[PDB]
Amino acid sequence: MKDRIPIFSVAKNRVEMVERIELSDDEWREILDPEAFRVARKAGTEPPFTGKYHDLHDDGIYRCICCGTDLFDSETKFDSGTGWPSFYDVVSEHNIKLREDRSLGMVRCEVLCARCDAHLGHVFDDGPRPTGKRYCMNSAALKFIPRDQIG
Ligand SMILES: [Zn+2]
């Protein structure tokens, strides 16, 4: 749908609107990343793995390599302990979208990319109060970038 999407760099106190994903297949090899192009054929990885590490810190944000848009301010990530693609709050419903359900017996909302509803995952009420929701998302989308353009 020909909408445009806000991107609120909440933790950086910025707001930048960008268009929706409207390209042709030809764009997706010259305006994409030198990782998005390959990820575009392999849904992340041709081999089932390519290493075993996770050596990071709370800097950077997530950037959906599957449409080119950035989102989660990394306080809305984990890193230490397990760094999992699961979290307990969000940047905003700006480049991510939810629909509520009760699909565990409490609160199970879907979690999809509001510019590319490819897979991602869902959120489930499952953590300690107050931020006791538990988002988890599972796709190739999960590249990082520096927080915005500070690098
Ligand atoms: Zn996306």
Domain ranges of the chain: 1-151
For every residue of 21-70, DSSP letters joined together read: S---TTGGGTTS-TTHHHHHHHTT-SSS-S-------S-SEEEETTTTEE
Q: Which two tokens stand for residue 34?
A: 């030198």
Technique that determined the structure: NMR
CA distance 151 to 57: 15
Among residues 128, 127, 145, 122, the alpha carbon closest in space to that of 73 is found at 145
Residue ranges of the binding site for Zn(2+): 64, 67, 113, 116
Collect residues with CB below 5 Å from ion ligand 1.
Answer: 64, 67, 69, 113, 115-116
| Architecture in CATH for domain 1-151 | Beta Complex (2.170)
Residue ranges of the binding site: 64, 67, 113, 116
Residue with tokens 């931020």: 131
Q: In what order do the strands lie in the sheet containing 108-113?
A: 86-87, 133-137, 121-125, 108-113, 96-97
Cβ atoms of residues 118 and 66 within 8 Å: yes
- One-letter identity of residue 102: R
Q: Which two tokens stand for residue 23?
A: 């390209």
> Ligand 1 center to residue 5 CA distance, Å?
11
Long-range CB contacts for residues 53-60, cutoff 8 Å, separation at least 24: 54/83, 56/83, 56/144, 59/146, 59/147, 60/144, 60/145, 60/146, 60/147
Cβ atoms of residues 135 and 128 within 8 Å: no
Cβ atoms of residues 24 and 47 within 8 Å: no
End-to-end Cα separation, the chain, in angstroms: 32
